[PDB]
Amino acid sequence: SNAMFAWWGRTVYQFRYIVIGVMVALCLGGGVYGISLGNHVTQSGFYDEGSQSVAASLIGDEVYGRDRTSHVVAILTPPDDKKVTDKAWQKKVTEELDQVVKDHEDQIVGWVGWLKAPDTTDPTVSAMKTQDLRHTFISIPLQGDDDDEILKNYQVVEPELQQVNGGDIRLAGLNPLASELTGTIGEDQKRAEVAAIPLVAVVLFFVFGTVIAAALPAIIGGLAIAGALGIMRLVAEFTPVHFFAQPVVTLIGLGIAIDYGLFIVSRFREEIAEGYDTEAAVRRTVMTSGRTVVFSAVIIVASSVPLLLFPQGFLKSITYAIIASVMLAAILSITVLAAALAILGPRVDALGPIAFAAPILVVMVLLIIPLGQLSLGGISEKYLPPDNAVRQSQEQFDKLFPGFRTEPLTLVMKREDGEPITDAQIADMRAKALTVSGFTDPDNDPEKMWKERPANDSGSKDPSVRVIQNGLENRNDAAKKIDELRALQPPHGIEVFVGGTPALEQDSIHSLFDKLPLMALILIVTTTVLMFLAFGSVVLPIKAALMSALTLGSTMGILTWMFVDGHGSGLMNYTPQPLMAPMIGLIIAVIWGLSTDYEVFLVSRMVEARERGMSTAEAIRIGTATTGRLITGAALILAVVAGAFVFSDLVMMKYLAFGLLIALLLDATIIRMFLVPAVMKLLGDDCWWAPRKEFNIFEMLRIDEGLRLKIYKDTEGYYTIGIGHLLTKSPSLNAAKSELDKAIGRNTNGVITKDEAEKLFNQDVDAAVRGILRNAKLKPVYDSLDAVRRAALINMVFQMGETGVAGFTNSLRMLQQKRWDEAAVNLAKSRWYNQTPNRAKRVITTFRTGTWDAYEFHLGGIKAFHHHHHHHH
């Protein structure tokens, strides 16, 4: 979990050109493929595919024919205050309808209404005119055998349909609504493009203050959107992908991808500032923030995968879109972006107590409970704003022609014997149905209840299956009534499925509450276990768990307060109503994933700040201080993009956009600035509790002068051993062993162990220090600098002796005055740099940054061994 990133940090620099070359190609390549996604999405996926109501629907459609009476209904109004019985007006509007049908029989079944045969004596067909005879409504059924294909047929037809009767015609019903709701997806996209993008740019340019560093996270976000669209278009080949998946790509793209790059470009900028070369800088960015971004991605994946337990194809498409977008953004941010930073380098900056935890926990259990007012429902026309025209057409359809809009509950019966269902068997099942109270009798007659479902040409008309249906008299009674009709023991040899839109809707709701317990368990445990792996603590996952658990109930609290009870509904032009039931599942996961993502970008920095070597109090203030500006900048970029989506006409889109605004504002202030810094010193030293090598001068000179466990001849021809330790200049090898035996204290016959070399090396060091402390030109600088920077100066004394490095009077002076950059530049102009660059560049870098990094990740190995000065004996 800590060396692969060092592995990848090195190689993304070596092959930086092909890396930026291939994945930009594929993302753009995915972009051209993915643009077609909108023509391969579905509106279906809100019900439970394994439910008995879905079985009841499936069987009922197959046998009786899909119900198409609610597809399109159109209200007609004669102009100039003529009345619909005007035979001239009648003649002109029907021949217009007849012409629309003949032009579009591949999409229109036909049109039916009182306007056909206006001399009829039918009570219901005469109920298609109003009493003042100034409005009449026709029903216009259409071709197709899934929702999607039928909607694409309505949109071909309605331009030519809206113009009948000189435009004085209002279109309502299933397909007009579905068209308006699915049409909000496209409008919310263009509002993101227009408002969020420039706003995001401004926030970036304020966080970085320079064009190049600001433009990079924007280009990453663009590439992730292009790549994720290509992936989801590919997923479309194999399984239906809901409409709602496309806005999810845009969100994560403009939001998380851009925020991922903000964290990385910011970390590259700091490492440049601390004196690291750019290829050093790229490696340590990947090893820290790249690891943080990667583990952020897997956390979010760990939070969205649990939604795959729910059956709705709607939640599955969304889950796939989160997964694809999020890690494409992680992968993009440590490939395309890192390679870019490796190419440019510094030119990214080229252009222009209990006193606060208590009165806050009080107000967040304050908000958790407005829940319990939470109610759930299906799609109605109320998902649109009240001034929306087609919603108004529906609401006046149901005012002028009441009683045609129905949601009958269905008892689909089938006998797998295969032979017909006799009249006594349905009279049987009918009798069992009148058992249950709560159903409608416009006839005051039980004998006229539970009529057969109507049947049309699309139906197979198999005799071994019959459907009877009857509307409900109060739909809030539906869940229990449905359970009651299923409790009926069927006749002998028949299976009875309970159908109807209230059965589909209710069965969907029952599946969520049935799998919601386990979903909550998987989610919080895997996120918990994950954070234990990211830090090594066992309380910092548990501190994050109950904070996240609390910002969840509070945000759900406000949302119910706003969308069930309506506080803000008049302001923001939405109707208060029960929530789309699978929206609760989606909202829970994404908000949980957001709360725990905040607790990694802040705490993983102070986990880093403390493992370096510090106590608590400061580690948290370092962590909070260095991340303070970045997390707000990241917070505002999310808040900007989400703020565009709160103005969506579709009320489930507003619900979700608001959930994130309330959630990311609550954590970017109340939690991050106040509550957990409080609890982070409150329980202050066991933050890092869990039940389950430092570099040094030995290891650095081992790299620069080698480590040899048996006598060898150096470049000059002299017998050497260990770390550059000269034994003798005698040609006799026996004289070298005689001296090696003397130095170690035993018969070596030319070989020592590692610890023996270490004991020999230390003696050489001690002699080098004694010399340094006895030179007027080296001792003052030597005293000036720290343990690491002293090792670099001892290295020089080893390679060239005291007189040698004492000749660097300027650079030693600059080092004494802590002017590291000036000394690094001056020393690199020496002759010692050009003769032994790999070691001089390595040593100078240690003066610049004051750490071992040039030695912990070094190039190749050395091939020319040379005994150092200050060989002790």
Ligand SMILES: CCCCCCCCCCCCOC[C@H]1O[C@H](O[C@H]2O[C@H](CO)[C@@H](O)[C@H](O)[C@H]2O)[C@H](O)[C@@H](O)[C@@H]1O
């Ligand atoms: C981006 C957000 C978009 C918002 C969503 C738009 C709301 C419009 C809802 C229109 C649905 C048409 O409802 C009318 C139909 O419903 C059921 O069939 C539907 O339910 C079955 C089991 O699910 C499927 O197998 C059928 O294919 C499927 O047509 C009935 O069995 C049909 O007799 C009836 O014709």
Ligand SMILES: CCCCCCCCCCCCOC[C@H]1O[C@H](O[C@H]2O[C@H](CO)[C@@H](O)[C@H](O)[C@H]2O)[C@H](O)[C@@H](O)[C@@H]1O
């Ligand atoms: C969420 C949005 C919800 C939208 C709500 C909108 C609901 C609208 C329901 C419309 C019900 C229309 O009613 C349909 C009627 O017309 C048909 O009969 C006709 O059949 C022959 C056609 O050639 C002719 O002989 C005669 O015109 C006639 O008898 C059917 O047999 C019956 O079904 C019913 O009588």
Ligand SMILES: CCCCCCCCCCCCOC[C@H]1O[C@H](O[C@H]2O[C@H](CO)[C@@H](O)[C@H](O)[C@H]2O)[C@H](O)[C@@H](O)[C@@H]1O
């Ligand atoms: C700081 C950021 C730097 C770079 C950010 C730029 C990202 C661009 C915003 C989103 C990417 C381009 O659009 C992505 C979306 O559009 C596609 O095509 C459609 O685009 C319009 C839809 O309203 C119509 O004009 C067309 O009918 C139709 O083909 C897809 O159908 C959608 O699935 C997809 O979501």
Ligand SMILES: Cc1c(C(=O)NN2CCCCC2)nn(-c2ccc(Cl)cc2Cl)c1-c1ccc(Cl)cc1
């Ligand atoms: C899980 C998450 C996060 C998150 O943890 N972000 N982390 C990133 C690193 C820094 C700390 C915050 N953000 N967003 C997000 C994305 C776009 C916008 Cl417009 C607003 C937001 Cl809230 C979402 C998210 C994911 C899926 C959906 Cl369907 C909706 C929202």
Ligand SMILES: NC(=O)CN(CC(=O)O)CC(=O)O
């Ligand atoms: N790096 C050094 O200090 C060597 N100096 C020589 C000196 O200061 O005596 C060369 C210079 O003036 O830059």
Ligand SMILES: NC(=O)CN(CC(=O)O)CC(=O)O
């Ligand atoms: N062959 C080597 O690696 C010797 N080194 C010099 C040394 O290690 O003393 C060459 C260099 O660093 O440029």
